[PDB]
Design a protein around this ligand. Structure first.
Ligand SMILES: C[C@]12CC[C@H]3[C@@H](CC=C4C[C@@H](O)CC[C@@]43C)[C@@H]1CC[C@@H]2O
Ligand SMILES: C[C@]12CC[C@H]3[C@@H](CC=C4C[C@@H](O)CC[C@@]43C)[C@@H]1CC[C@@H]2O
Ligand SMILES: C[C@]12CC[C@H]3[C@@H](CC=C4C[C@@H](O)CC[C@@]43C)[C@@H]1CC[C@@H]2O
Ligand SMILES: C[C@]12CC[C@H]3[C@@H](CC=C4C[C@@H](O)CC[C@@]43C)[C@@H]1CC[C@@H]2O
Lengths: 7, 219, 227, 218, 219, 9, 11, 11
């Protein structure tokens, strides 16, 4: 969720 | 375009994450927290660096997360070795977090990995790794961790060969330099695997509170 | 000293033999497939040492450096050989002339399917790159000499550079442009990182099989497996 | 002591590895083709010793017996292995995975063309018989022991009979298949004799430089 | 037909060739002189014996001469071994030409062939090679000397099993005996090859004169 | 030659 | 390393 | 007989 948001 | 690609990677360079030593002497869990907090902070800036790479955002979303899944520890160790390239026997973890080799005798197993990081740094230093070379290679680590990707990895390869040719050395020496540089990817990958094995057992034996990106990446 | 072509020919005549292994009469299980692969690896190790001893200058290295290099490389060289054997058969891994394992056959061994998909993936890349026989010879010798980073030190670096110049010489003979030669060279050694990754994962997998007592390592394979 | 099953299985796990040889860059000359074959034979001979030492009981004989058997059989065993690799490729001899010579390629070496047609003929007879991999194991071991020895050579013969019995064919066809395979031994011994005369002739004229273990077997 | 074939084999058995020992002791030229004349006379009867093989004449002219060219030394040596089966240490070349092994020293290199003929003779002696077994084996030679010949060789094979089956031994001992006999064929083949290697050498060294049938086959 | 006639029977 | 050392020193 | 004797007595 974090890495998907940071991209 | 090699000239244009070299500059883009130069401007995409991440900042320098700051951190310091625990005032109390390092223990097999305080150093584990310091490096995991650093890695967590480095990870946030690495995604921003990856998105600034030309064409990376044009890749599929699943292709993006997969590339960062297998390359993030290789990239972190590669940036660490470049920071330590001018300091024999030292690891520039941060501008204020500079450790010696014998400090790795603290946490279990990290002494074996530090020696791999220092020896790869030694190899990069004897080759006199240049700044524009390290930019092209570090981008190769990400793009070579697992259709438009083949266009990126290729063009980045033209950039490193372009950079190597800028030194004006013999054509046979340019092939020898390129081979010697790319031959070190296997050692960066090796230390990355051994490190991924280490940080995994540090979480299972409960020695490192993993959180946020790092916990998501370690999964 | 030797010329680049002389080094290539020396590598050719040092090629180890194809170890023969047959499938069991009974259908494959986890215990018997691990038995077959380790038996194949244990026999191939013997020929590998004779192969390394025929690389020019390798025996001039100290015994400590000879040992350290073979411990670090043996799984990579064996994996690189399996991949050369399988390069023309996509979907199959040609472990031996009569031991051709289809990809789905690894489902009987716990966790071997990921390493099978790794080996097949890199093999397909070597296939799409059209890896030549002479390049494969240099690449295999480079795997051994580039394995561990740590007078014998001077000979080692000279050894690695000689094989590298031989590979550059072999690529230069192909007649493609100087920029295509640099690209080909780069594409080939970028796969060295993938081979080292497959070696690391296979090393860890085999150590679990030995730890779970799933497979009995014996003699040479046991001696190397320690570390 | 072993059973016919364990004897065949031990012979299976004693199979020598396939020696790798490549065709030279230049076209084949009589001296170069002789160089490739003698190098192939020199390497194969190293692994045959390891294979012969794994035959149950072979290491129990006197050294002179182990020597004398290998001196007289080593060629027959090499051509027998060659014919097994070539059993599915008519008109071709699979000397090595990268050394596949068509028949007419023998017209380069003087004298070898007649020997090539012998191996190809015997290969075809083994192919028409549909020789089984388990039978081939016993035959190769019998070639060694037919160059305590009577007991070992009877044990391998017992195992070959046991293999033919496991095919389920009639008791006549078992005696018939046994005789058919046993008679091809004479054609193999014949190929060895004619092949050895060619090599010794090639040696005395210094056509091919033989070396080490191949030299010592001559 | 098995019983009928064995009977036809016996009826076709060649007569004994009449040859005598020289008055003077054997010299290298005189020993080769006697053995070559004996083989010449034996070669005439063998052609007649081969023509009586049921179905031999049916073969083509090429197959007829090819079988006789490639086998004629094997059959003569097989016949010689048959005459010396009950007499150890001696080779019964003829009723009056009886030769002990040590007499082979008269000729250079013949001793090795003499010991081979005698060693294989002793094995046939150990197996107690019956008469009718010898008739089959001798006909298998010439047939197995490299469609029509296939079934021909198939009949002599079935006959040998019938002669072994009539002995009454166990079925496992039947296969054992059938294997011990046919494995000695390769020893007969080996003896023939070395013997041809000697005769051509003896002719080329002009030690013995060769003419008529023997010269025809030798060429 | 001679074998041709000896077989010509 | 008994086996590896022996195999490296022989011929 | 140098190599054969050596090969027959090793592993
Ligand atoms: C992952 C470990 C903590 C984090 C360390 C790693 C060695 C090198 C680096 C790169 C640096 O940029 C961040 C820390 C990082 C990623 C260590 C190896 C063992 C330990 O588990
Ligand atoms: C090491 C494993 C057994 C040995 C296997 C490896 C995959 C590929 C090869 C190459 C072949 O030449 C020898 C066996 C070898 C080395 C396997 C991966 C998992 C398993 O433990
Ligand atoms: C013996 C010759 C060289 C060696 C050759 C032989 C034909 C067949 C074989 C078997 C193969 O495994 C090795 C070479 C070997 C043994 C040749 C026939 C003529 C030449 O002299
Ligand atoms: C062929 C030789 C002459 C002929 C000899 C042979 C040994 C055995 C036999 C069988 C006998 O029936 C006739 C002579 C014959 C055929 C000899 C071996 C060496 C010499 O050249």
């Amino acid at each position: 969720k974090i890495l998907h948001r940071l991209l | 375009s090699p000239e244009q690609l070299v500059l883009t990677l130069l401007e995409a360079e991440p900042p320098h994450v700051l951190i310091s030593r625990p005032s109390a002497p390092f223990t097999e869990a305080s150093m584990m927290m310091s490096l995991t907090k650093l890695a967590d902070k480095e990870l946030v800036h690495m995604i921003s660096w990856a998105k600034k790479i030309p064409g990376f955002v044009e890749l599929s979303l699943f292709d993006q997360v997969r590339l960062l899944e297998s390359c993030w520890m290789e990239v972190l160790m590669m940036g660490l070795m470049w920071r330590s390239i001018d300091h024999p026997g030292k690891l520039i973890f941060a501008p204020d977090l500079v450790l010696d080799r014998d400090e790795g005798k603290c946490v279990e197993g990290i002494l074996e990995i530090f020696d791999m990081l220092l020896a790869t740094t030694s190899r990069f230093r004897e080759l006199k790794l240049q700044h524009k070379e390290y930019l092209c290679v570090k981008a190769m680590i990400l793009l070579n961790s697992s259709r438009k990707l083949a266009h990126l990895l290729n063009a980045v390869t033209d950039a490193l060969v372009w950079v190597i040719a800028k030194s004006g050395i013999s054509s046979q020496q340019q092939s020898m330099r390129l081979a010697n540089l790319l031959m070190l990817l296997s050692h960066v990958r090796h230390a990355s695997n051994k490190g991924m094995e280490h940080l995994l057992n540090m979480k299972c034996k409960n020695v490192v509170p993993v959180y946020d990106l790092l916990l998501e990446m370690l999964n």
